Design a protein around this ligand. Sequence first.
Ligand SMILES: Cc1ncc(COP(=O)(O)O)c(C=O)c1O
Ligand SMILES: *Cc1c(COP(=O)(O)O)cnc(C)c1O
Lengths: 380, 367, 371, 371
Amino acid sequence: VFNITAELKMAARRRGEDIIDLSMGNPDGPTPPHIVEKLCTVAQREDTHGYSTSRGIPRLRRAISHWYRDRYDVQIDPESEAIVTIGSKEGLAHLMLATLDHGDTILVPNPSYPIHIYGAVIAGAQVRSVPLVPGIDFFNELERAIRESIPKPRMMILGFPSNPTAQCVELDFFERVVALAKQYDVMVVHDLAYADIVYDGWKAPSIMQVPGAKDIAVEFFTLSKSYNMAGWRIGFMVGNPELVSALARIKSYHDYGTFTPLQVAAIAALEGDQQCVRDIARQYQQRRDVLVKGLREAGWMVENPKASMYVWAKIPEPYAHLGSLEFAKKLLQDAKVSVSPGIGFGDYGDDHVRFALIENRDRLRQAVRGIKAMFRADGL
Amino acid sequence: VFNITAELKMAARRRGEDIIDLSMGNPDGPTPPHIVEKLCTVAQSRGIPRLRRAISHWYRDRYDVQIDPESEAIVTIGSKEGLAHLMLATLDHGDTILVPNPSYPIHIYGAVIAGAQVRSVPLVPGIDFFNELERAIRESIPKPRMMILGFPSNPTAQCVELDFFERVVALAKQYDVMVVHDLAYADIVYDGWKAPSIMQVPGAKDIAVEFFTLSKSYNMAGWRIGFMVGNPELVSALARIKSYHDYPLQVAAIAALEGDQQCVRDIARQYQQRRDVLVKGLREAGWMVENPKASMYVWAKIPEPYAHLGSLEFAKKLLQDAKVSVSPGIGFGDYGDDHVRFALIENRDRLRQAVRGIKAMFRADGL
Amino acid sequence: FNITAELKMAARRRGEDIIDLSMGNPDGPTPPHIVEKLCTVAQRSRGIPRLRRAISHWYRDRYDVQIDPESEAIVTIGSKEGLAHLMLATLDHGDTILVPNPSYPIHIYGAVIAGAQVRSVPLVPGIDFFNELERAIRESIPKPRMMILGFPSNPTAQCVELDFFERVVALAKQYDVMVVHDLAYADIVYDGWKAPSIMQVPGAKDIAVEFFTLSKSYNMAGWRIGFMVGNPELVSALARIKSYHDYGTFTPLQVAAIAALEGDQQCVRDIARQYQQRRDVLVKGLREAGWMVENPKASMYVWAKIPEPYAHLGSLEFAKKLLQDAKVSVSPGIGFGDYGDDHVRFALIENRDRLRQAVRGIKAMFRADGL
Amino acid sequence: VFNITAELKMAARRRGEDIIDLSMGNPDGPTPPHIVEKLCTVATSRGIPRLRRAISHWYRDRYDVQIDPESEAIVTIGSKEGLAHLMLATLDHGDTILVPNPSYPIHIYGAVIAGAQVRSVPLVPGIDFFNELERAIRESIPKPRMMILGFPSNPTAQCVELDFFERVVALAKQYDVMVVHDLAYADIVYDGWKAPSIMQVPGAKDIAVEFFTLSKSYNMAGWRIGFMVGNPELVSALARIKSYHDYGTFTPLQVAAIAALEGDQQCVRDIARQYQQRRDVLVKGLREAGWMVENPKASMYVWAKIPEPYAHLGSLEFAKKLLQDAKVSVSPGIGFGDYGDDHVRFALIENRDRLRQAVRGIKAMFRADGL
Ligand SMILES: Cc1ncc(COP(=O)(O)O)c(C=O)c1O
Ligand SMILES: *Cc1c(COP(=O)(O)O)cnc(C)c1O
């Protein structure tokens, strides 16, 4: 369905229209200079080679261990419990191949990030979606989902802060999941891509802070959003040492490691001064504030996200009959603002659209003006 | 879990106990002698045309339904097998199907063949089955390929009216989800209650198939002869799968269908009287079990004071203390853990003996 | 086989008297003492414990072989269905099995049901079979899970000695490839011969199972009753699979199976010797006509090399010629694998007079043609 | 099984032995500055149009082949991964693919990971490869869906001419078996020899695709960039699976890739020359010691027949001896398929002084063995 709104947008650009594109999570801004300089400097050294070791260069797995200790007081063995990925999409897709085949089911929330589905369907797995929405007991539905699939699902894939809803959970959420996943012996994957994209002084919890999460869980983190990595993919997975090893084995038949100069560049991102991450977080918080306040002054009472790069907006009553896909087309044609239709994230999302905070503030104000002129011209 | 209770039962008889076996669902009764005689005489790809003509007449005479015997009917060696081959023809390996909970698992073998995965759908008092069915469809990605239903129902004895089927069929067509219906207990009905066929619903043949076995109606337990009727493209799919075998009870089985039918009535009558003894008996003992309106089963809710134990442990209690073997409800799914299933497959004297074994158990536990 | 069965029926609807030696179904009646028990018990998960005892005694008295009735034998609803279930128990979807070419396709149903791929191993005169079998084992990755064999063979009638099996078993142990052997035609033996069991090879049960269908030895076509013996862990696999499938094998057939296997074997001796006399009439008639066929020593088939003037036709089109011109239906050899395409199969399923009418139509065809 | 050889090597280093590592074929030389520069200054699923145009020009200039950049070309993330995805897009459980033996093990793996089974076809002096190749097609049911080839070859260094490819293509077209060709070593050619593309065969595109990686030609090892050309449907298939995975655009790397293809091509010739010089030193050195290895005509590899006195040890054991006695790590031929158990592979990935050091170790080992 995102193909549909990608086409309409591109048609609008080719018509010459000035479209505020708030429909993708591609960071707009530049990569921090220390990171780019390392990459370039290391690539230019005659002794450098692109290929590296199966699990990542030891110094980088060390940096990831340190990142866990410092942020979460969590122990990750760099030798056995950490592995460098070529971004989390690669990482996940490969964990699924290693772990899933025809005859297996994974559980995903609805609405959620569709990448987690594709990988599993590509690996041969079936997907069972679990409602994650206001006024439904998630833990009842998750436990139903486990009990009422035969055979039980091998795995459940969660991601907080959430894409697309911006939902944040505290540590007692993770305790429940973990105790539940151990009870039925279902593996937990957790996607921590938005851990640094956090507003109002809040911190994102890792699942690896629960005692014995390592016995049942793995956790993916990507550098894309925290460090504005554009046209570069790198991250890691940690936790259960057998799952880390199964990802290592599958990867050795696919790649020669992550591009070495990018791995060295990741060391410079993860180590040392993290002001560039706080600035990126801050830049999103203020874009959030212009968007949310502006939509509200126009009479669209959108909810204020506590994290992620997304405002997950409930379709106003007077347009609710249209559906998300139809509404998002209207926003594009009438307001000259590209959004993602909520239905693209699962059927429980059809009453919403998602905005990504990827244009600057003036542009955002221009998006708000376009939406407000639409309301006015529709008689609202 | 049935293997668990089939082995404790055989361990009890290993020990010289007089166990009243009400746990299998297999007729004790004699096959009508005219059918057995025709087997003796005969001994001296879609199935025999004659046998396929017989099902067509059957479908017309019972249900006013048109079945073309050239294309819309196929003989099977039983519904487990036929369901296996359909699944094989219709699923990609690993695909999903919908099974009610609680229900008799006629899919297990198909699941082994197709690598099928089951989404269990609650079919229980208190919950809206259609909302749950549509939910399970929607929430499985990709969509399930089929839903397997059976009325009258094993193990619940739940019967349905035509309007259920017109409602399943309308929903099936809405999501292009194939409907398989097992009419195995169509003749075992009580009190002028009657069993509709999903094929009475107009346009059913665009989305549904129906299986019937001879084993319950005619006491042909293990003769394994049945048939499938429905969509002609799915009949043809089965015929392909059967043709890979490249290959007498079929012939004998003609007598069952096109012969005199009083024996089918007499069989249902036998089960009805048996039902009356156990139900009456259990109730004298204060076990206020529901009277079934159809099928060979009494679906008994576990008395509150035995509720804590769960179906498995109550069944162990029953086997140890009352010398009666029952099917624990959880063998039919988690939504059956508060029941047991009795099969009316012993004689009435023996049903009485079981009633007295249950009573005493209750006398000794202070009820 | 469908093609030739359609042309045959076409010819009959046109009023032609076709001598059908194409189908392969026993025409004789089931011995009374067998039928008797089917009737009587009908009126009144591993197989009946008594029937598995009758299998155990069968192997002890015919092959001096110990088969433990409680763990090493199991009753089947025929060998085709029995093989499918074994395959479901031991194959992962998409795995490969080895099969001789040419051979009768008893594997096909299992292959489709278990999702198995097939690798054929040429089994023909002048090709080292063991070379090809091991080569087929080594050139497949992952290793094939099983090889399927059947001696006396359908369609070639080939017979092997006990040494052929001790090499198979020894090879199968080397690579850890399961052996399945089909003893179907063991009792259909001629001229004083006794057919050997793979289970006579010491430690055969470590790597192999053996299947017997009652159909051929006892005129029990359509009865769908046989057994498997061998490895206890493979038998237990089959017992599990079968428990999901059916409540149990039709007891009257099981008790009929006991009459067949226990006691007086005079009726199997008589069936054999009948096939022998039919063999002699067809083999002799065909040679008299300058069709120099091989003579089988077991089984019901005369595996007949296509005469050279008709070799360019292939087995399909030549068999069509037999049907059209001689009024005889044979099974083309290609239906058994491409390495059969210079043969046709004859089944000894008509009476001697009918077999002579065939030989006669065939003689006239050579005479009408150039030969 | 190259894990055993990599573990022994690491053990030796851990003991301070100076090991000349000629096992894993990892290019050791630097990427040309002009390529690497484009990484610094720049920092759909079919690829940047300009890159696909460069691909097109490369096929037109080198081979006189027309490849529509719109429909017949796709940027991969390198051949290893790109092939792995083509396999996931085209293969599942129930398929079999065909691979030579000995051959490049990474093809086998992508296929297996996708769930295909693999049938290997001997490609060795003394055996007729096309006869065995057609047998492998005909004797597997279902018939294999694809065959994967690569010349010049890893590990054997075999080079073929266009005549070879036009017989593959015709055989492929006769049986409708797709053909995958790996052109990774197109530029690593010696002594004026030249490697053809399967696309020079007219109608190749109806049945065939070709992979080329920038890794060897341009010392871009681990850069995760290449492309695939040929059949538009297999190209579209690769395109769709890429969309769903969304592993990334990697414009900087595509941009660098453009610099490789459009830049001065002398660096490629320099790279080939360097390997030709290292080959001259290893071949001449071994021969002076009395090990008369075949001179490769292309590829980073010397494919050395185990000398007769050591033949009996087999390749893994002879490789181990080479590491212990000569202080040289080689890859044992059996890791490439059973038909390679009589060779070892050297990779020309160490400089000439080091190659001299290897040779001296190997000579000292022949001398201590009295051979
Ligand atoms: C939940 C989540 N995980 C991962 C990613 C990005 O993954 P990668 O590291 O491959 O860039 C995103 C970007 O959309 C995301 O939203
Ligand atoms: C091409 C390549 C290889 C190939 O050598 P093998 O030892 O045969 O695997 C290895 N590593 C890299 C980085 C390569 O590019």
